[PDB]
Design a protein around this ligand. Structure first.
Ligand SMILES: Nc1ncnc2c1ncn2[C@@H]1O[C@H](CSCC[C@H](N)C(=O)O)[C@@H](O)[C@H]1O
Lengths: 288, 211
């Protein structure tokens, strides 16, 4: 599909003597997957600012990052003054809530409802955190969304962000079936999925003991995908974290139920997919 | 917000970025403002107002086939725009965010002291959430200009922009409203529904002083 045409801006590599840690703005953070991947790659983080509403996700971040995260409330409360007073950013990330962007809803409300239009909030903060002309600072940005969108919606998003959406499927690097569009200007945006041997490709490596995988991988019949003691059992939450690439026992931070952990892990990013995406940032920024 | 004034001896033509207008309001109303407009841009998805604009204005207009085709190269190729207007004909937020996306790329950068003027207008069918979110997006507050002090038929609009003379001094005009049109039903459909004559000349009034 060639509807628009624009070259991706490739920044020159900075040497090690002018190497600086990253300043990261994370708009729709949720479960703090971005800072988790950044800490796993061994990258020094000078400032991480997450604008999260949901208190369970804020609790996930406060437990798993120990007060490193600077919290904002709603993204509508962020102005241009808040962007220009919190220093210039080096990495902007986010994925808008796809309640009305997904075409799996028969009665979907579209891009221009209060769940979808938050994307434009992103664009506004994309417009504020972007450096002006004449500044050769390497500025990188990343937007995530689902594959189940309309043609006009994806076309308008691609025109607004001015980048080619690469499609990445979790089955090439992890044990999940979800294809996601990624807008951004990272180097090697469409390079193939370098599967890490430490990543759990099959489903059975993500299971616990005493459980047999019925399928080869899981999706995002009135049965259950795991047999347990010759009985079909629901897929566990820690096993869901191992499928989604998270560390073991990650989203157990408060007194939330099983349904809350499902709602948090469903909306979260895939750790291996991000690790692939954030990989070339290591040569552009600080290392630890 | 107040900007310093340029002397009026610098007579330069006006670059107009008119968005989702359809029938060309900006080119015609700036022709009958009394200043020379340089180039005009027109684009609309619907075909009726594009047909009216390509028959009426004799083809002195750069036309774009669709509003979903203008890129940053289309902004920087046709010169930096001094005037950016959005003329109103679930596509309400569609037209607004198209206007805001193209306004972000026509806004002068930090260092340019160019006098930049823009204008957005919208109907009174706006949700309170739409109101407060869009007022966060534009970082400004609109003004209500109504047709209860100036006209008989109901017309109420709220305006955002960089156009002064909008806080307390403006009341109701007397001459151009009563010499504008006669009120009949077909004329209520055509020129009474039309949003070209009533306030847009007053919003383009403080622009002719700079150029
Ligand atoms: N207006 C808003 N501003 C900021 N966050 C919001 C928000 N509305 C909802 N959220 C929260 O932000 C998250 C966006 S949903 C997708 C999250 C993202 N894909 C991830 O990496 O986890 C949701 O968990 C939701 O609870």
């Amino acid at each position: 599909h060639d509807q628009e045409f624009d070259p991706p801006k490739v920044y020159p590599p900075v040497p090690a003597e002018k190497r600086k840690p990253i300043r990261v703005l994370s708009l729709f953070d949720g479960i703090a997957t971005g800072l988790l991947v950044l800490k796993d790659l061994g990258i020094q983080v000078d400032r991480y600012i997450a604008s999260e509403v949901c208190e369970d996700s804020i609790t996930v971040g406060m437990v798993r990052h120990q007060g490193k995260i600077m919290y904002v409330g709603d993204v509508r409360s962020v102005t241009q003054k808040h962007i220009q007073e919190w220093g210039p950013f080096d990495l902007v990330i986010g994925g808008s809530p796809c309640n009305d962007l997904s075409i799996v809803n028969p009665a979907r409300k579209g891009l221009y409802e209060g769940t979808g239009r938050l994307f434009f909030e992103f664009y506004r903060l994309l417009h504020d955190a972007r450096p002006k002309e004449g500044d050769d600072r390497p500025f990188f940005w990343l937007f995530e969304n689902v594959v189940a969108m309309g043609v006009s919606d994806k076309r308008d998003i691609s025109r607004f962000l001015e980048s080619n959406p690469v499609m990445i499927d979790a089955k090439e690097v992890s044990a999940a079936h979800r294809a996601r569009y990624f807008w951004g200007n990272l180097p090697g945006m469409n390079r193939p999925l370098a599967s890490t041997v430490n990543d759990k490709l099959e489903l059975q490596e993500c299971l616990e003991h005493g459980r047999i995988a019925k399928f080869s991988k899981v999706r995002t019949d009135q049965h259950f995908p795991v047999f347990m003691n010759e009985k079909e059992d629901i897929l566990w939450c820690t096993e869901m974290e191992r499928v989604f690439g998270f560390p073991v026992h990650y989203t157990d931070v408060s007194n939330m139920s099983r349904l809350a952990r499902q709602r948090l892990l469903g909306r979260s990013w895939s750790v291996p997919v991000i690790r692939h995406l954030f990989a070339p940032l290591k040569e552009y920024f600080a290392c630890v | 917000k107040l900007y310093p004034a340029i002397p009026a001896a610098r007579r330069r033509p006006i670059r107009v970025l008119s968005l989702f207008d359809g029938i060309a309001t900006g080119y015609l109303v700036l022709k009958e403002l009394g200043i020379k407009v340089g180039k005009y841009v027109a684009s609309e998805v619907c075909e009726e107002s594009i047909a009216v604009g390509t028959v009426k204005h004799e083809g002195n207009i750069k036309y774009v086939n669709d509003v979903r085709n203008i890129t940053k190269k289309n902004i920087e190729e046709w010169g930096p725009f001094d005037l950016v207007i959005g003329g109103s004909p679930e596509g309400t937020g569609r037209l607004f965010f198209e206007f805001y996306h193209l306004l972000n790329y026509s806004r002068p950068k930090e260092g340019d002291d160019r006098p930049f003027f823009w204008m957005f207008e919208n109907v009174v069918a706006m949700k309170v959430g739409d109101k407060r979110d869009i007022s966060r997006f534009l970082e400004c507050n609109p003004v209500m200009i109504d047709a209860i002090k100036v006209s008989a038929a109901h017309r109420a609009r709220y305006f955002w922009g960089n156009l002064p003379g909008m806080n307390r001094i403006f009341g109701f005009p007397v001459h151009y409203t009563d010499v504008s049109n006669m009120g009949r039903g077909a004329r209520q459909k055509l020129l009474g529904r039309s949003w070209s004559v009533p306030v847009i000349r007053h919003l383009f009034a403080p622009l002719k002083d700079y150029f």
